[PDB]
Amino acid sequence: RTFLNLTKPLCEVNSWHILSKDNAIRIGEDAHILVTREPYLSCDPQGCRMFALSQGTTLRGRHANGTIHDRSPFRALISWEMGQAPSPYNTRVECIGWSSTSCHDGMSRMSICMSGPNNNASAVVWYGGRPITEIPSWAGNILRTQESECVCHKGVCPVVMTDGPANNRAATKIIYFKEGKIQKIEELAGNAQHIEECSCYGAGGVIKCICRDNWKGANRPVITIDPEMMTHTSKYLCSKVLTDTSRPNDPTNGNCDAPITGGSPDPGVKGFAFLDGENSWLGRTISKDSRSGYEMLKVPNAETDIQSGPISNQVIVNNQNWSGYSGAFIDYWANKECFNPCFYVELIRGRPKESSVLWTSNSIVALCGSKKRLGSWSWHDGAEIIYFE
Amino acid sequence: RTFLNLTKPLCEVNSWHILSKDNAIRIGEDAHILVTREPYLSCDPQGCRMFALSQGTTLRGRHANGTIHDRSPFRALISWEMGQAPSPYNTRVECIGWSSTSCHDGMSRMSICMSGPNNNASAVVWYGGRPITEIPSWAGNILRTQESECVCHKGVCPVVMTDGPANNRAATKIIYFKEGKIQKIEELAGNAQHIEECSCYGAGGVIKCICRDNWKGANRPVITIDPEMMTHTSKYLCSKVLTDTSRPNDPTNGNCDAPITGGSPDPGVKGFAFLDGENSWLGRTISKDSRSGYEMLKVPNAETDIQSGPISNQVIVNNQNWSGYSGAFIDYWANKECFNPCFYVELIRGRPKESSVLWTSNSIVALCGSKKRLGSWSWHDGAEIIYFE
Amino acid sequence: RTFLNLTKPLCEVNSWHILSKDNAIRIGEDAHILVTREPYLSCDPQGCRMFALSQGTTLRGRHANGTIHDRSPFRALISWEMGQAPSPYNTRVECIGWSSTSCHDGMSRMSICMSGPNNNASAVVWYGGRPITEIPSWAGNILRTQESECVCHKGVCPVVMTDGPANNRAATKIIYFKEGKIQKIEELAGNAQHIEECSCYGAGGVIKCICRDNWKGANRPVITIDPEMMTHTSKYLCSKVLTDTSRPNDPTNGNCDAPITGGSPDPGVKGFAFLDGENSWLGRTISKDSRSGYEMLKVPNAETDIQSGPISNQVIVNNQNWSGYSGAFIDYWANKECFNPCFYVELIRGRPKESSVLWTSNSIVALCGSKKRLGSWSWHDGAEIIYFE
Amino acid sequence: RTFLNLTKPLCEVNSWHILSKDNAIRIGEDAHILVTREPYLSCDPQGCRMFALSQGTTLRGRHANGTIHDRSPFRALISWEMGQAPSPYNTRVECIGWSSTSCHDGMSRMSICMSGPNNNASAVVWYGGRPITEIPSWAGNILRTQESECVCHKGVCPVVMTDGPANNRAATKIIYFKEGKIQKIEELAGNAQHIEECSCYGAGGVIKCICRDNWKGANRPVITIDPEMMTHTSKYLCSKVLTDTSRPNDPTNGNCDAPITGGSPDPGVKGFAFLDGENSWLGRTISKDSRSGYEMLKVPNAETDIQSGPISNQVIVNNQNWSGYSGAFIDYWANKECFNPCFYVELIRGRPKESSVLWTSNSIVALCGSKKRLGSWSWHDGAEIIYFE
Numbered sequence A, B, C, D: 001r002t003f004l005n006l007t008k009p010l011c012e013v014n015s016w017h018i019l020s021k022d023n024a025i026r027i028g029e030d031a032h033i034l035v036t037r038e039p040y041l042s043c044d045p046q047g048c049r050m051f052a053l054s055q056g057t058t059l060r061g062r063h064a065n066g067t068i069h070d071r072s073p074f075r076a077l078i079s080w081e082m083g084q085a086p087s088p089y090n091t092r093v094e095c096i097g098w099s100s101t102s103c104h105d106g107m108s109r110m111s112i113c114m115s116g117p118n119n120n121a122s123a124v125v126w127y128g129g130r131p132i133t134e135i136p137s138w139a140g141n142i143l144r145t146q147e148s149e150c151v152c153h154k155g156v157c158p159v160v161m162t163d164g165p166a167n168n169r170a171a172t173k174i175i176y177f178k179e180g181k182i183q184k185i186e187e188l189a190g191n192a193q194h195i196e197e198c199s200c201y202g203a204g205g206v207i208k209c210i211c212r213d214n215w216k217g218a219n220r221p222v223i224t225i226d227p228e229m230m231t232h233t234s235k236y237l238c239s240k241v242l243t244d245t246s247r248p249n250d251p252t253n254g255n256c257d258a259p260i261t262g263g264s265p266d267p268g269v270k271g272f273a274f275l276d277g278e279n280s281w282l283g284r285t286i287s288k289d290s291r292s293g294y295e296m297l298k299v300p301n302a303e304t305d306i307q308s309g310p311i312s313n314q315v316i317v318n319n320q321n322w323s324g325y326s327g328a329f330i331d332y333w334a335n336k337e338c339f340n341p342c343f344y345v346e347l348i349r350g351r352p353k354e355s356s357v358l359w360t361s362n363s364i365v366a367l368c369g370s371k372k373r374l375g376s377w378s379w380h381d382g383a384e385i386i387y388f389e
Ligand SMILES: *[C@@H]1O[C@H](CO)[C@@H](O[C@@H]2O[C@H](CO)[C@@H](O[C@@H]3O[C@H](CO[C@H]4O[C@H](CO[C@H]5O[C@H](CO)[C@@H](O)[C@H](O)[C@@H]5O)[C@@H](O)[C@H](O[C@H]5O[C@H](CO)[C@@H](O)[C@H](O)[C@@H]5O)[C@@H]4O)[C@@H](O)[C@H](O[C@H]4O[C@H](CO)[C@@H](O)[C@H](O)[C@@H]4O[C@H]4O[C@H](CO)[C@@H](O)[C@H](O)[C@@H]4O)[C@@H]3O)[C@H](O)[C@H]2NC(C)=O)[C@H](O)[C@H]1NC(C)=O
Pocket: A014, A015, A016, A240, A241, A250, A286, A295, A296, A297, A309, A310, A311, A312, A313, A314, A315, A373, A374, A375, A376, D119, D120
């Protein structure tokens, strides 16, 4: 048992294989399944787990009514064995609140949750199942974090947090933890103008976080973090293949150093990419407008070339089915010479897109890279909304 | 691996951070959640667990009818992983009965339950999951104990017990256990006139128990225990800030050595305080009359100064919501140089305050100290009683 | 870690303290609780567990209809953590069948289940969770065994089994196992005329089995086993205090060497006693006729004195409540210089005594000896049959 | 802990003892039990587990409607403790998809699942709970595998897979894995004309797979694999006792090297045999037309003699009850000098044979060899379909 070091490069990825699916809404139609949203996965030396923010109610429960609402005192980060659906019986409460991240440093798991009212939220930082550090809101406006896993190197686990407006300049910080204790705090530097919901992964001693600009950009901000020097830079994804939602049509050229405006009607969604020269993959919703469908696009030099476009594609969720947030994770403890990219897609069901029920929840699908050329189908949620009416 | 020794001082506390919330009533509206009351938490080298007295029925079950009643042969002390709701599937039966305490001595857990008829109750003392000692009623009138954790030092774990009237002088004893075996029994001495439901914690080699005087005082009794000499003293919290329920208005001065009487309509509720000079915090219900709301008040020198008043406050449960019992615990095994105060509030739902249902149950919230100035919100139970009608 | 040796004497017993109660029928009115009967408890170095024969249906399930029937292909021996109720989610399947015993030898657990048709049943003998031995019926008429725990000494676990009529002479054998393998088989010898459902315990290198004579006696047969020599003797309890059900009134004198006959309308019930000279306790139903109530009677010299009567009594279940089978077990791994007697009472609900429901099931209560004089109350099942109508 | 090798002979078998039965459909009438089909068992050093393909819904759930369908994105291979019924709360997701195999090599478990559309399926090969290898469809027509356990020798675990028509010549391959990595791929050789759903076991350093010819043969193909040389041969079972369903009446002679045509209306079912000279047992449905009943027949020299007929029988499921798939497994880690044959029968309930419900699911029974002459009875599912109407 030892601290994870980010000593490996990313594996070559030519297609995506199925890792896990929990079928939570199908199962939750009859079994005692918690209402969730903002799911993710995170691994440790022993295996991988599913994570999400509970709403503190089952899906068929009367208290599912009103679960469109993002923030309440009844939310908590919960984790469970990958592939099961989240029930009150198989879930571990990681921390209490309505925004989270989690990661394993090789020794123990750090989990962070924000809670409180909009103007006075706070984070509690847990390590090894115990509370270590507390962080008060610095801007008084929904202190919040990644909603997917953080990444650790030599015990140092950077986390990106934001406090301030969703629709204007906000105060983003990079906090570097070790065993749950703050080693350093940096204010966001560089050319990213707005940061939400970073999706992060590590390779070759570098952590890259692909985020959501909720203010201006339909191109995604990219934060590049050195966990040894505990320093960073920021800019935007260069590619013309825009990957936030909502977004306009892809332009003839991207923009590395400024947000590309447009899209309607949504200011953003959490998403991700793996950036590795030729071996670069962008996720996005198939719909330009709404959280519908999900596709993976291989976009060589997306990080550096404004003219970069796709050379291959894999549909993950067809555009007749609802998607949601998406994020990066890696099983850093696999028995491989390279770190293999993985991602999840949150499959949102109910409100607001499906108004015939009173609730909002999700299920999860996760995939990882293959070097092979694998066939694919749509991994949509699979529940029949009419059964809940 | 070794006995806990209470070597460390209390941590400085300037505000309270969220630790856990189980949302039991919300979840139990649909899932199979046991009816409980008199909850608490207690930790050990590996972590913390929730505890409560089951009523031997689920909340939606027909047997939840009648659960306002305190004592039956169907009650048991159960424990479960912190943050989960208590189901028939995830709970450990610690012992059988209708009054309890539990604590870990660093080696194993001691749990104690009283059971039987009012005039012929008995305690069974468990250690490491096995029954060790039994104690018959000495006064033939509801032998009973703390309803929150005990505290251990060098393997010696004092427990405060009462047998006798709830509304007149009773027979309290302090029993000092080691590995579940009685080392010494003392009769209550000093100026406290009636003792119930002690909330106890340890720091700097001293155990302090903040109790309920059900006979006279709206100020709370304090028993100070030397766990090495196995002796004690008792008196009242000195502060004018009265912290029982029901209580009168706070007087000009409190009284260290006698009860401050008054209030209506109820003679008491279990509560707690942390007493450490300037670093002193008193919990109480927001209402003077009813078990509604919950507030933490920083009252420097509350233990010693009859003129001591609050210098800061944090609302835990707003006064539009039901509270209940409250009690102390500490994660004595944290990786900190001090022992950090924690507490829980029982959030009672149903009878008698909510008579539209046939049951009485609760959920739990728990918080611990922070040296930071954290923002706060209300951690009320969150269930809609109309859903249960 | 080491084979159990039955070195220790029995502890002095002056009253009985509560050990466990599962409240299964109360809980199972709403939660998913298996239908059972023929429960018992059995301990091991780590803890104690509850055992019973499942009916392969939940209590509220439609397949609970018809569960008065004793033998089907849908029964199995299940175990679970002591104090929980048996659900499909918390139970281990020990073996498949409709008659059972189980014991731990200090290293691993031996479990035995008989299954098959009446004329051609077979036992499968499991050790450490694997099947070791199979035993075909020797008399073609419901091969069957203890329905409570067996006892082990230096790795040898004797088990009493019967094959043959329930209402005439049958063929009983004592089979001596080690690691699930047959070391020796003996035909029953001595003065017991019929043997069913032995309740066995060890002390001072001797195993005593207190059984049910279903053919003649309302006095209980006693088999005394030497597990080192692998030999035995049999006779009847001497005491005039008759402990089977149905039974006649206690006569002036019992009979050590022949059945005391009579009683109406039923030929027997599984029960138990602890026999240790002056330190002897007999359990029985309070009703002479029906499986109603339960009482413990201290009967000095019950094993040797035909005139021995009770000097003490403790009501375990009041005579307004249903009881059932009862049996012996001991935590042989307690940290005590003596082995402390324990017993359970099966609390049968439903048919045939409560014919307003279509099912038969039970809950469990268990108690162990105290040297103190503890108060007592009735530990009846506690479910309202009306809720099941 | 070492790699398993197969250098023990098969135990002598004269009858079959009950190993496990989950009663899933009875329990699932009113507990949260997943809809499954294609079950099996597989063992490891610690014990044995049940496996099946979930349909990603509970049995009583509305999504159970339409579970006759074999392939969907909502299916997964799940495993659970032997004898329990499969719930969302007690099941481990081994991999995602709609055809599987699994086996333990002595060190870790390999699990394989195929998923995707009919024309573009792919296998993901897991080892020790992590994805190792992916395999694309080679024939574009439902890449698929055994639906019962594989077998490992000195690290090498062969797996039989088919891709191609169910009703014409297909492309079968034997893939040899070590720690989930491909060691070798072979195309099917020999005289078997079509291969589905192989049931495999090892003995004497050889793996024998008894399979389903879905194209022509009512006699079952037999593939003999040497896991050291990593080569194989194939032919048909010689015996005149035909063991596929549907099948004609048994002829006066079998055929070792060609399919025997006939039977109506169905082309095949997964089944199994143990082939060991005089010690040979064949399973089959009792009905020659339908998946009803199940019988074991001892057919000396079934593998080599076209005139070989039964010398003994045991009815496992009576012919008034539904059966289904059946397959081989062995506890290779038992404490015996020989490998004892075990098998399971899938007990299918619902569609198409029971059209009064909207679903298709199963329960499991499993039996192992005995050298004794044990009595038998029918181990049918035991649910009443009307309870589901
Ligand atoms: C088994 O399953 C596997 C796994 O899924 C399947 O393999 C897959 O096979 C397909 C072909 O069948 C390959 O498709 C290739 O994808 C790339 C990239 O495509 C993405 O980007 C395109 C451009 O997008 C930008 O630009 C457009 C405007 O131009 C904007 O609208 C966009 O917003 C972007 O800004 C885009 O058009 C593609 O859309 C398609 O996919 C999406 C999902 O992402 C769908 O929703 C759409 O409906 C649509 O289908 C996509 O987003 C293309 O570049 C490839 O085109 C080349 O190849 C074609 C032949 O395959 C050929 O007709 C084209 O003219 C073009 O040819 C050029 O390049 C070839 C090399 O690729 C040369 O050979 C050729 O000579 C020439 O120079 C192609 O469309 C998948 O990548 C592949 N995936 C994997 C993971 O292997 C397989 O099909 C399955 N088999 C069966 C039997 O089902």
